[PDB]
Symmetry: C5
């Protein structure tokens, strides 16, 4: 069936896009909260799939699978807050940001089944674009290829309550692309990725698209 090769089926399925960890005390948790900016170019697997196209438009479904680091669940009340683009992100475990009515928040117990929410098409432009041959502001670093109109928002996680939580939390964020539309197909990345924000490739070790053989007649 040709349905299997349709843009939609190719970009369906919820995949893991991030793994936030909030230990009781260690390196980055005397805070008590986390700010994860929604990022797709996170996993090279999904990134390569997207960079097959120049422009894309879609909705995103997020599912929040949390539990303690060993898999155990406890009666802990959590809060996930979506900070749209152009909005101020929490800077402390108790910033005013957490009370701002305009930053939709979802409250759920770690015992309750995973929370699920859908985020629309945020760009101010007609489509997200993985490639911008210009500057949003010149030969050159910093400020090139960067298109801020792809900014999808930020998710701020934290345990509820005035005192810090006794439990460490390991949260897995899954995302599913709904209603996909793609434009202008381009060559498939054949060089290892070096950065999230640009096509730079290792220029000394340029790998060949295909494996080799001895003679052009041996097969």
């Amino acid at each position: 069936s040709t349905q299997e090769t349709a843009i939609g089926n190719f970009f369906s399925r919820a995949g893991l896009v991030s793994i936030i960890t909030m230990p009781t005390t260690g390196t980055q948790n005397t805070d008590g909260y986390v700010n994860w900016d929604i990022d797709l170019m996170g996993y090279a697997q999904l990134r390569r799939k997207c960079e097959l196209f120049t422009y894309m438009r879609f909705d995103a479904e997020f599912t929040f699978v949390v539990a303690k680091p060993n898999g155990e669940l406890v009666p802990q009340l959590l809060q996930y807050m979506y900070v749209p683009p152009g909005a101020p992100k929490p800077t402390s475990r108790d910033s005013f940001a957490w009370q701002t009515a305009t930053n939709p928040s979802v409250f759920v117990k770690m015992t309750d089944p995973p929370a699920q929410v859908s985020v629309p098409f945020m760009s101010p432009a007609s489509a997200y674009q993985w490639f911008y041959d210009g500057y949003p502001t010149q030969a050159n670093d910093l400020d090139y290829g960067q298109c801020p109109n792809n900014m999808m928002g930020t998710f701020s996680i934290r345990t509820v309550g005035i005192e810090k939580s006794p439990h460490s939390i390991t949260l897995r964020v899954y995302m599913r692309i709904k209603h996909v539309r793609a434009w202008i197909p381009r060559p498939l990345r054949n060089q290892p990725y070096l950065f999230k924000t640009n096509p730079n490739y290792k220029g000394n070790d340029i790998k060949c698209t295909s494996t080799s053989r001895d003679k052009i007649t041996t097969l």
Copy 2:
């Protein structure tokens, strides 16, 4: 879309309107209960938004997010009682008020998902009014601008059971305005608020509506 600028969308979304805390023993809890009169002029954020209009009419949806102070949940049975206007409020952890059939009460376990209830348009007048240029009873303090026809009711929280609860409770009250209607738009508050019940402003430090610059030509 113009829908985004519609009165309804502007006043939608559930925001935090109050944070009640009932510790086992400290300052105000050898009682075991709390009486929160429904108050909107609580958070200056929402208050400024309302004082953009003279009269407003609407329904209110209340959601009760509770848990212990650190975010943990325990099998504690709670009772939230709505004491309408003109009704007697509980004066002790065990007043008759808690048994009065006419004071609707909702019983829920701290484990159960947040309780949610809708309160109608209580005023005896056609609309709530954030400004009353008269007296409900004269140059002058006390008894001015005060309109008792805006009184929306009181919520009385307490743990159920004859003995006091072993757990401390931190309850967050969220409110959402439904079916909003507004009349007679007025200037937007440009001076810091000094009191909940009146427009008094600091008259020595009168802030300018806009920032300044050197010359009227430098830009």
Copy 3:
């Protein structure tokens, strides 16, 4: 709206009609069960409301709010049995009565949300009557005004299991009157109540229906 003054709205709302307590061991609990005969003339508040009419007919909805005496809930299996009129009531924590198919019983865990059940119009007569100027069998005590055709049934509560429960239980019984019909309105009780089963009033201290004043002209 006149709807607010309608017999139905006047007698709606679930009110507390009884508070049964079953401690592990104290005065009346080496038993392990309780027999509460359904009684409305329990709370003078609701009683006065009913004695505004001579005859009344209605269905009753019962809700069972239970928890330990301090409000905590535990995984305890309880059984509530309705013993109709003319049926034999349990006389021990393990009478045959608890197994009698004809005594409908509802089993629920103290963790599960409150059990709710509806009891119909039990009287063998066309309506319940709060006043019977005769004898069911003469100037006179005992056997007067007593109409057994108002007998609505009994509720027998107990913890399930062959051994006694480790936990103390405090159960609140709420009742709501559905489909109300009233006949022959009568004067409103103006003297304090002395007994559940009769209009006897303190005859030495007869209180006046209204407060007093000095002169009939001072106001």
Copy 4:
């Protein structure tokens, strides 16, 4: 209403038909399982009701109310297996019988609300019969009145898991007769029952159907 005297209403309502107890260790539980053959002639109350008719046909609804002996519930996974007639019953806590696809089994946690299942009309004959004036194979004991075509099946209870359960279990089995049909009404048992499988009565102490009085004129 005549509806109350209808065969259906007379045989409705779920009654207790059995009480299985599986202690950790005592007399009959170093096993870890129980085999209860579905038996109606268990409780003389229901038995007398059935023997008012010669033939009966009906479906049966079974509800499984379990908990520890004191009424407490714990996170124990149980398995109830229905072994139809002509099928092999488990002979050990781990017989192959428990894995046989054809023996429908229902898995439920003691925390989950009571399991409920419906068993159809199993007899190979058109109706169950409480009386068979013949032999299924002669004056005489053993092998008389016994009709094996009334065999409804067996229920095998056990805790899941390879190791024995730490908890003792007391399970109450309730049964409700659905879609009842009865034929050929007969005299009502007036002598105490002596056995489950036959009408034998104590012949020395033959009780009179009615109480006595002195003279045939005194009343």
Copy 5:
């Protein structure tokens, strides 16, 4: 009724197809995960039933009944991942395989009721075949009768979380055949099975299809 002898009814009902055990530490669990390739020829009971036909086509419903080895349940988050045919299976408790979007995974708590999922008809051929009189690649062992087009997939179980789970898990996998279709009926296996992948039988001890008797006239 002939419905009882229909291919569908004959192959219905969920039966146990596998019992995976993941102890904290013992022989095969310092790993923390398990890879069970979906196998029907597991239980000789069901296998014999299938080998009554040459070709079969059907969907499969899998139910995952898990709990600790003694039947107790704990708040443990588990993950069941379906690795289709031609896909790479996890090789460690934390392989990339567990993050691969294309390997559908279902997350469920051991407290939640058993997870249930349906797997379609995976073969690249029109039907699964329990007999292939050829080679997929000759008199002869290894590489005969083996048809890889019957490969249905693999299920990879594991506890979620970065650290190993404190609890041992015993998981029972039930399978139900939906929408069955069978072709070309063949003789029923009358010799004990020796291997999962071939009809080899013990040739010294060849058992007779029927029991014996003395004379051909004694009955």
